[PDB]
């Protein structure tokens, strides 16, 4: 269940963990829209049913537009909302109401290293069983968001700012 | 209310825009801490009431919002919407990142709506989002729209399908 709204770090970890996907903002490298912000929908997982770590893992292909973008500028902002569940519908909260909790995680997106490759794979493949069947020729790699900044919109008033250290220090 | 033929990417894009009550808007951040970084954020939207979706994404925005402070400095933005916002992808067994779980990106500028278009924006938004009638006047809400110059549709294998604004708006 949703953590107390005053505990922003806990709220962020709750929302990251319950999201199976989110929207990732990048800078376009396409010549026609070069330099303009771009948005895209990615599947994600921070871990299996009882062990969400807050780390957003992705499974990506060099063919993807967002990956072309990250090759030229690896900064990205991921946004997730509880409107992705039935939470907001059930409470009658408009998706734009800060009662319909949403968060933004910004940082850089990198290919996961050898040590973390097994946890990334397991986190992603358990949550997304279709990935096992994706086409091998598209050259899939495991990636992650390295979070440097966090905004939490869970009540009226400004965004609540949470440090990566505070976010990762949650159980 | 079923999904159009996937080959008709213009029709599919209009279908997605109309079934979406919200989307993710990407802007360039003007926050000191992260200036110049791509920023994403969740906005409510509407293109019309139930039988009059025009395809035009209208927003109800406040100068207090992070996205709006970004748009004042650079009005370029990209909105994305996915059928994973409904039960469509779960019911059919399409992973949210499978192109079969349709998602679209509409890129352009966000501007304040004209006097002559305020009423249609208002009617479109307030009917889809009745809570907005109760939002605080102190936030100085205004009606905004996305002016679309570029459209990508992910609705099948084989990569993105490009749709021109004129194809998208000529859908009936």
XYZ file of C-alpha atoms in Angstrom:
343
model
C 0.000 0.000 0.000
C 1.050 3.650 -0.601
C 3.474 5.033 2.028
C 2.581 8.180 4.007
C 2.818 11.098 1.622
C 5.226 13.015 3.904
C 7.816 10.238 3.412
C 8.893 11.203 -0.124
C 11.833 8.783 -0.391
C 9.572 5.857 0.509
C 6.903 7.078 -1.880
C 9.395 7.259 -4.779
C 10.635 3.688 -4.098
C 7.012 2.478 -3.968
C 6.146 4.088 -7.335
C 9.337 2.892 -9.102
C 8.698 -0.663 -7.887
C 5.018 -0.908 -8.830
C 5.654 0.465 -12.399
C 6.198 -2.059 -15.266
C 6.871 0.768 -17.690
C 7.461 4.513 -17.831
C 8.138 7.395 -20.212
C 11.758 8.396 -20.936
C 12.677 11.907 -22.116
C 15.821 12.238 -24.261
C 17.298 14.795 -26.696
C 16.545 13.895 -30.294
C 19.434 13.165 -32.655
C 17.127 12.941 -35.727
C 18.252 15.786 -38.062
C 14.681 17.124 -38.629
C 14.132 17.557 -34.864
C 17.801 17.701 -33.809
C 18.170 19.032 -30.274
C 14.453 18.978 -29.451
C 13.155 16.944 -26.476
C 11.854 13.524 -27.323
C 9.679 11.100 -25.310
C 9.337 7.376 -25.544
C 7.703 4.453 -23.699
C 10.004 1.780 -22.143
C 9.380 -1.388 -20.146
C 11.286 -1.421 -16.804
C 11.810 -3.293 -13.498
C 13.649 -2.617 -10.274
C 13.294 -6.196 -9.116
C 11.058 -9.170 -8.376
C 7.877 -9.270 -6.262
C 9.582 -8.873 -2.901
C 12.909 -7.242 -3.746
C 12.526 -3.879 -5.489
C 15.868 -2.006 -5.239
C 14.770 1.289 -6.790
C 17.216 0.753 -9.705
C 15.302 1.176 -13.039
C 16.594 -1.524 -15.423
C 15.855 -1.462 -19.166
C 16.221 -3.931 -22.053
C 17.170 -1.921 -25.157
C 18.207 -2.270 -28.786
C 20.600 -0.159 -30.837
C 17.690 -0.013 -33.371
C 15.576 2.093 -30.985
C 15.165 5.833 -31.426
C 15.821 6.461 -27.683
C 19.072 4.474 -27.893
C 20.259 6.576 -30.886
C 19.524 9.563 -28.748
C 21.394 8.236 -25.691
C 24.481 7.532 -27.827
C 24.762 11.305 -28.475
C 23.490 12.512 -25.020
C 23.081 9.923 -22.261
C 20.991 12.225 -20.043
C 17.417 11.137 -19.554
C 14.438 11.747 -17.275
C 12.041 8.879 -16.539
C 8.528 9.642 -15.364
C 6.052 7.184 -13.778
C 2.545 7.736 -12.403
C 0.151 5.686 -10.218
C -2.331 6.382 -13.024
C -0.608 3.396 -14.592
C -2.473 1.316 -11.956
C -6.080 1.607 -10.814
C -5.053 3.760 -7.838
C -6.118 7.083 -9.329
C -9.348 5.845 -10.948
C -10.365 4.149 -7.692
C -9.826 7.382 -5.620
C -11.233 9.741 -8.230
C -7.880 11.576 -8.521
C -7.252 13.332 -11.831
C -3.923 12.117 -13.439
C -2.574 15.650 -13.158
C -3.576 15.988 -9.436
C -0.596 15.583 -7.192
C -2.816 13.135 -5.175
C -2.366 10.904 -8.228
C 1.229 10.403 -7.209
C 3.852 10.769 -9.917
C 7.663 11.001 -9.801
C 10.546 12.035 -12.074
C 13.961 10.379 -11.954
C 16.715 12.055 -13.934
C 20.325 10.951 -14.589
C 22.182 9.049 -17.264
C 21.361 5.831 -19.009
C 24.214 3.270 -19.295
C 24.723 -0.298 -20.393
C 24.826 -2.441 -17.256
C 28.248 -4.010 -16.346
C 29.143 -7.653 -16.039
C 28.617 -7.769 -12.213
C 25.098 -6.342 -12.369
C 24.097 -8.176 -15.570
C 22.493 -11.118 -13.667
C 20.394 -8.989 -11.348
C 19.284 -6.786 -14.303
C 18.332 -9.816 -16.343
C 16.448 -11.472 -13.490
C 14.694 -8.246 -12.431
C 13.608 -7.632 -16.033
C 12.766 -11.151 -17.261
C 10.597 -12.044 -14.252
C 8.582 -8.834 -14.603
C 8.577 -8.979 -18.447
C 8.403 -12.707 -19.624
C 8.006 -11.582 -23.270
C 11.565 -10.321 -23.324
C 12.864 -13.949 -23.457
C 11.188 -14.167 -26.889
C 12.325 -10.834 -28.360
C 14.251 -11.116 -31.701
C 17.983 -11.929 -31.070
C 19.000 -10.008 -34.202
C 18.029 -6.683 -32.594
C 21.088 -6.983 -30.357
C 19.371 -6.461 -26.934
C 21.461 -5.092 -24.056
C 20.683 -4.471 -20.361
C 20.744 -0.868 -19.300
C 19.994 1.257 -16.261
C 19.175 4.754 -15.154
C 21.899 6.201 -12.929
C 19.774 8.519 -10.849
C 21.143 11.912 -9.828
C 17.914 13.896 -9.252
C 14.404 12.986 -7.968
C 11.144 14.962 -7.817
C 8.125 13.584 -6.049
C 4.619 14.985 -6.653
C 2.417 13.410 -3.950
C 0.659 16.352 -2.362
C -0.224 19.966 -2.976
C 2.594 22.472 -3.114
C 6.006 22.185 -4.748
C 7.685 18.960 -5.973
C 9.407 17.256 -3.060
C 13.141 16.811 -3.777
C 14.696 13.531 -2.744
C 18.449 12.714 -2.926
C 19.625 9.505 -4.615
C 21.157 8.648 -1.235
C 17.811 9.076 0.553
C 16.064 7.076 -2.238
C 18.496 4.159 -2.032
C 18.577 4.106 1.755
C 14.949 3.039 1.936
C 14.326 -0.628 2.755
C -14.194 1.629 -30.004
C -11.673 -0.821 -31.495
C -8.102 -0.402 -32.794
C -7.921 0.649 -36.457
C -5.879 -1.320 -39.061
C -2.269 -1.091 -37.993
C -1.155 -0.190 -41.556
C -3.211 3.011 -41.225
C -0.778 4.653 -38.866
C -2.640 8.026 -39.188
C -5.913 6.447 -37.980
C -4.105 4.533 -35.216
C -2.413 7.692 -34.020
C -5.743 9.484 -33.828
C -7.240 6.475 -31.965
C -4.480 6.570 -29.306
C -4.684 10.365 -28.888
C -8.441 10.198 -28.352
C -8.422 7.214 -25.870
C -5.670 8.833 -23.770
C -6.652 10.967 -20.742
C -3.035 11.819 -19.992
C 0.472 11.536 -21.451
C 4.120 12.186 -20.779
C 5.506 15.502 -22.076
C 9.255 15.897 -22.685
C 10.716 19.429 -22.374
C 14.176 20.890 -21.907
C 14.838 21.682 -18.265
C 15.463 25.271 -17.196
C 16.140 24.241 -13.572
C 19.634 25.420 -12.483
C 20.440 21.948 -11.076
C 19.809 20.221 -14.409
C 19.674 22.974 -17.027
C 19.629 21.668 -20.577
C 18.650 18.092 -19.563
C 15.600 16.397 -21.187
C 12.802 16.411 -18.638
C 9.636 14.250 -18.562
C 6.374 14.913 -16.737
C 2.753 13.642 -16.557
C -0.020 15.882 -17.952
C -3.771 15.386 -18.286
C -5.050 15.997 -21.855
C -8.081 15.801 -24.104
C -8.742 16.082 -27.787
C -12.504 16.327 -27.475
C -15.643 14.897 -25.924
C -16.916 11.340 -26.664
C -17.510 11.440 -30.451
C -15.598 14.558 -31.333
C -11.901 13.761 -30.866
C -10.107 16.196 -33.110
C -6.642 14.811 -32.520
C -5.479 18.159 -31.065
C -3.910 17.585 -27.619
C -5.278 20.328 -25.281
C -3.725 20.848 -21.849
C -4.720 22.860 -18.765
C -1.514 24.299 -17.364
C -0.198 26.627 -14.646
C 2.946 28.846 -14.676
C 3.816 27.091 -11.367
C 4.463 23.773 -13.195
C 8.009 22.612 -14.023
C 6.905 21.801 -17.593
C 5.501 25.329 -18.124
C 8.602 27.085 -16.781
C 10.543 24.975 -19.367
C 8.129 25.907 -22.226
C 8.449 29.626 -21.547
C 12.151 29.273 -22.410
C 11.858 26.618 -25.175
C 8.334 25.758 -26.494
C 9.527 22.566 -28.244
C 8.089 19.406 -26.764
C 7.227 15.765 -27.520
C 4.167 14.058 -26.051
C 4.006 10.228 -25.801
C 0.969 8.086 -25.108
C 0.607 4.273 -24.952
C -2.322 1.861 -25.004
C -0.651 0.425 -21.842
C -2.637 3.272 -20.198
C -5.738 1.091 -20.808
C -6.172 -2.651 -20.289
C -5.560 -3.227 -24.009
C -1.964 -4.468 -23.734
C -2.534 -6.674 -20.692
C -5.650 -8.347 -22.200
C -3.882 -9.150 -25.485
C -0.587 -10.146 -23.901
C 1.481 -7.378 -25.495
C 4.400 -6.194 -23.325
C 4.325 -2.386 -22.940
C 7.511 -2.126 -25.104
C 6.202 -4.417 -27.868
C 5.103 -2.221 -30.859
C 1.903 -4.258 -30.699
C 1.225 -2.342 -27.488
C 0.690 0.774 -29.540
C 2.535 3.875 -28.549
C 2.896 7.163 -30.427
C 5.049 10.277 -30.140
C 3.755 13.715 -31.239
C 6.414 16.341 -31.475
C 5.986 20.107 -31.979
C 5.469 23.206 -29.802
C 3.184 23.876 -26.902
C 1.468 27.278 -27.056
C -1.334 29.144 -25.322
C -4.640 28.628 -27.103
C -6.221 31.512 -29.116
C -9.311 33.423 -28.003
C -11.347 31.747 -30.778
C -10.195 28.231 -29.703
C -10.424 28.619 -25.876
C -13.984 27.342 -25.726
C -13.354 24.153 -27.672
C -10.209 23.498 -25.494
C -12.238 24.153 -22.365
C -15.121 22.013 -23.408
C -12.707 19.200 -24.535
C -10.742 19.285 -21.236
C -13.522 19.920 -18.671
C -15.771 17.177 -20.017
C -12.890 14.644 -19.973
C -11.482 15.974 -16.686
C -14.319 17.220 -14.379
C -11.909 17.778 -11.441
C -10.300 20.735 -13.298
C -13.451 22.879 -12.522
C -12.343 22.689 -8.848
C -8.619 23.498 -9.317
C -7.380 26.658 -7.510
C -7.737 29.992 -9.486
C -4.581 31.160 -7.683
C -2.546 28.850 -9.981
C -3.527 30.988 -13.002
C -4.557 28.032 -15.246
C -4.465 28.545 -19.008
C -5.511 26.440 -22.016
C -2.613 25.215 -24.073
C -2.229 22.977 -27.135
C 0.397 20.895 -28.895
C 1.003 22.102 -32.448
C 2.158 18.910 -34.146
C 4.896 18.994 -36.748
C 6.226 15.415 -36.442
C 4.565 12.091 -35.638
C 6.001 8.567 -35.050
C 3.755 5.513 -34.621
C 4.932 2.252 -33.123
C 2.130 -0.156 -33.911
C 3.869 -3.146 -35.548
C 7.135 -4.897 -36.202
C 9.455 -3.235 -38.725
C 10.145 0.030 -36.891
C 8.407 3.457 -36.541
C 5.869 4.644 -39.089
C 6.097 8.347 -39.893
C 2.788 10.185 -40.234
C 2.500 13.758 -41.443
C 0.323 16.249 -39.544
C -1.882 16.491 -42.610
C -2.468 12.737 -42.717
C -3.158 12.731 -38.986
C -5.699 15.612 -39.218
C -7.362 14.306 -42.398
C -8.507 11.174 -40.533
C -12.294 11.091 -40.178
